[PDB]
Amino acid sequence: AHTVKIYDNCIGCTQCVRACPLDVLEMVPWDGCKAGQMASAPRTEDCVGCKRCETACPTDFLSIRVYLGGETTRSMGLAY
Amino acid sequence: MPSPSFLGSTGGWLRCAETEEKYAMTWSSDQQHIFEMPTGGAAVMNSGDNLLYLARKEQALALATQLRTQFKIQDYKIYRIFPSGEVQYLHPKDGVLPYQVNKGREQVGRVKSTIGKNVNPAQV
Amino acid sequence: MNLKKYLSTAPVVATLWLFLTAGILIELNRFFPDSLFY
Amino acid sequence: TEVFSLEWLREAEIKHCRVAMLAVLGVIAQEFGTFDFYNAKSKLQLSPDLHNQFVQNGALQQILLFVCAWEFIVGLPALIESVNGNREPGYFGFDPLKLGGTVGSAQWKRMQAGELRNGRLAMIAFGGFFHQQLLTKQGIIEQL
Amino acid sequence: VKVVVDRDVVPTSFEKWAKPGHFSRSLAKGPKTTTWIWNLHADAHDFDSHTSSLEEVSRKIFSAHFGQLAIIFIWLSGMYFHGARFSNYVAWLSNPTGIKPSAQVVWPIVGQQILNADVGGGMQGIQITSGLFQLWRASGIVNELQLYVTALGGLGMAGLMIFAGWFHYHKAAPKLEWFQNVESMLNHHLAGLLGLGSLSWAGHQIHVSLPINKLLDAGVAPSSIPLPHEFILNRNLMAELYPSFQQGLVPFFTLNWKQYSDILTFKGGLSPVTGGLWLTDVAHHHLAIAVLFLVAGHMYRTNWGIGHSIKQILEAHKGPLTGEGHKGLYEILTTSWHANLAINLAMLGSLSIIVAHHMYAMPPYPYLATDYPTQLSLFTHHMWIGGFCIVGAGAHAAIYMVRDYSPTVNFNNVLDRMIRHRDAIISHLNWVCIFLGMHSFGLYIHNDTMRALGRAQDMFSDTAIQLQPVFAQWIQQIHTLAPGNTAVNALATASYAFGADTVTVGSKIAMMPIKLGTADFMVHHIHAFTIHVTTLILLKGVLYARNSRLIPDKANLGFRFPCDGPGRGGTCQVSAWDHVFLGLFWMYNALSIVIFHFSWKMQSDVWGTVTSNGAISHITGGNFAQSAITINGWLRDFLWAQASQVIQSYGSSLSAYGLMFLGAHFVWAFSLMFLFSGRGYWQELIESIVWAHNKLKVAPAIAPRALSITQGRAVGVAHYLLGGIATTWAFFLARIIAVG
Amino acid sequence: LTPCQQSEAFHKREINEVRTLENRQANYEANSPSYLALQSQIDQVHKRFDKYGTLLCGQDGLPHLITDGDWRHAREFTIPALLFLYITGWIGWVGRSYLKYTKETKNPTEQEIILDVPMALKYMLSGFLWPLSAWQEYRSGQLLAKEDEITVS
């Protein structure tokens, strides 16, 4: 489906999973940040790509990118 | 398991829901209450855990987000596959995703510049 | 005091100056024609 | 009930009660020699309808409305604060105010002595004085 | 019921006016963006987006009520002034036919004096279509002095309301308890406003009718008209003009009501002298409405214990398909200021349309039916007013599920069901819309095909006899035989549009038995199509505003939001306010087709002239007996022949209605800039201009940004409507003046 | 294309326009005061045609003109109706620019764009001789900018 790629601009303020609808991203301990959190998206098969994390993403250029890819039932958000 | 009663049809008896994977949530519900479904009107919440059927994943997570704002209750959502495969996709760590956990890993993570360079040096 | 601050707002100043510019032109087309001399 | 609104209300009462008295003492003064004497031939030439739309008095009223503007543009800020404008009449009045308070024990609030009664009497009397003489041609019923 | 007042809550100070955006701390600390400039005005009237204290929201809307009320009074006080300083109402009072209406003059500045239409009566100006002269003649106003006294009396009432909306607020303030008295509110709106209002005006047109009826209809000069007080000061004058006034409220107590039959009648139809309804039937009408409202204004609990109440009335209505029906609706309307506004906008919006229909059907004012420009203008005027109002009803009935609906507090299982089987309501309306579209407009495609194809339209004539004069024909025949039979006390029909072959003419045709035919079944179903689609999209915005299948967490985003993003294939324009934005557009199409239908069909078969050598010759003689069935006739004989009255007017005084006609297409196509492009490209467009602004540092501190995604669509519909009304506003005011 | 004082096809339009206006003029009584102003309006009409005749005007009666720079027609373009637009517009523009220079300082930038002290608006009259002084200050604008612009990346 969609391709989630995390920039190196992360501050770890958990804005992803707070905004994110179906919890695509996930906070993971990391050793190269101020707060110490990093966003990671294992369940990219279930990602829909609604692009609501780029709104809550603080950085000048956003830190969580999701490039538009293929479309499946998991990424169309349809109930049928 | 005792589940809230809802009238109005719409949600049930859909062929697509039967042939497609379905979602099953639950909540503690220590007290009798009254809530609203993300796709229905109003319904009374009974004591103990309550199992429902959901056809979308966003429908399965918005209800948990709405429950967390009411009272403080741990949520459990289980995501079933087409045949009969039942896997715990929600809270596989059992730790809340925004909060920090010990079980850490990285999936699909490129550590390059910000303007672009879409090639990934290593997938794992 | 504060009435002058409300008088100093963007819409009030804009309408006041535009009233001046419009009235000058209404009086211009009513009074002398442009003489224009080669 | 509020402060700043009742301020302009009581002020407008004072700002017109003196106007509603100098006009009465002006309209009566100009007609003191022609009140009666055969009812001044129904006000004679003083009838407003008989005037020539104020040809000669219009350019004079414009000058009056101009000077009266800045007169009240002095009354608007002189009321603001006590100092300068109102403070000098302040201690002037305080010279009769001290004697008046001595006659009236602790303070004798002058506003109860006659600030509201004069203010409202002038307004009501001038409102009726402008209708009986300027707002009735055919009486139909006798006016008593 | 208790006098609970919170005297002095907000002080009178210019401090808030000094701060641009004092109503919201979010719109005050950060005015660094151009978008903030538009947000300051977009949320300026969204009072529920500031503070949540209902005691203050009720003390911010009743203020806006008195403010808007003062604006309306300032507006009305000028109408009596314009019909006295520069107008022709007195000359028109003496000569009503030859003197065209006018109450607006221009000045010699840039040669614009060509707009001074030669109307007559020794005064030139701009023709008016507001019905002011008909209303003033029906009010007994003759002299110019009676205009100025009413205007100077309007200034007083206009000032008192400003000093009232500034009284119950900066000076006084009732508590929150004063607003849950909805029971005490309907007892004063249906009896104090509707009741005493229908009685006060009733008592007027009984003593002011004879200066119009038994005088101006006889043939007396306006100078020979006696004074209205001379009729009251001498009861015998009223007694001679009406031989029932000699009694003077004596059989009123004796219940000998028949002795008041000289002013109180139920004739029906129109009067063959004035040109409108009877001047005696309306007086009896308002008397009948007044007593009915004096009875209907006593229905709810005051502070004596008797009567019903909106509470238990709705707590008692049940129903099998409703379940816990009607209960909780009291808590629905008594808690949300919004909630009352949709049912008000809905009822009052349909009311403006219904009263617009009642205007042309039975003309209530004298010399109104012959005044074709005024009649045509007033109908479509209230028509579009109600269109906006009903869409506002949808705009706020969508607000309710988002802003004030809870799954614990306010509860009606009826509204619950409207949201529980919500997918069924719109499914029904959807199939109804499609059936009424693929046929009503399908038959348009069909007939337009039959003509260009050849002999198919010839064989369609038998079907043209079908549908038309098949239905609704018997309804008119019922109304023909309704007087005498089912109306023994009525010597005329409801209107002469019902009485067959009965034509009333006063040198110009007033009303006609509107013989349906050819394509009235066509346009009425084009209407029903554009009505069901409008109701569908607005009701969709109503009940889908809370629970949506696509996005479950809908209540978090809001009402006037853009969308969610490119996910799920594409979530775009899913807000209920957008169902209103597009609901404004289908209402636009509905009202556009209805005003087209009414306007043109009138001069097609109703409006015309009369000669003695013949009978009836219309302005456009019976054209839409064929030119209405196909789409081509709607721009071959309708939209085409109208350019000869809007453009061929530069040599006359109707040149402004051509400039506005051609200039309204400009602003309409200017709406095609916002309704098609996107903020992304335009935001990339500013930063280049901002680069030029950073080259000379002429960049403003307020950072240049594009319009909001929602504000662009709000301005887009604003121009699509303004540019989509001013054209027909210039068109309805084009031909009707040339063919008047 | 001949001038209209010699173009016989232009004076005919004056006669024809007054002829169309005369039918509207004669239906009302000239002795009435509300229509005595029509004679003053046609006086304005008459006083308008004579000045345009001096300008070269179309033979058709549609009065054309010159923008090539011909010194005989500088009145229709170059000198009056053109240069004043440039000066008056830029007297506003460079005055706005001077206000943009004083748009910073301590008091908030938003306060100094919108809620400005009226005194700056009263100082606007400063720009009597913009040209070269404005050129100096615009040089300084480009200079102190030091090519500080947006990324465009």
Ligand SMILES: CC1=C(C/C=C(\C)CCC[C@H](C)CCC[C@H](C)CCCC(C)C)C(=O)c2ccccc2C1=O
């Ligand atoms: C033009 C355009 C813009 C930009 C719109 C802008 C910049 C609005 C400009 C309006 C203002 C009022 C013009 C600037 C005038 C200043 C206020 C100065 C006025 C000072 C005096 C004249 C009073 C969008 O943001 C947009 C968004 C989505 C789809 C299409 C579009 C679109 O087409």
Ligand code: SF4
């Ligand atoms: S959006 Fe970016 S900066 Fe914010 S918490 Fe997620 S990874 Fe960190």
Ligand code: SF4
């Ligand atoms: S791509 Fe969409 S669903 Fe996935 S994390 Fe980002 S906002 Fe959430």
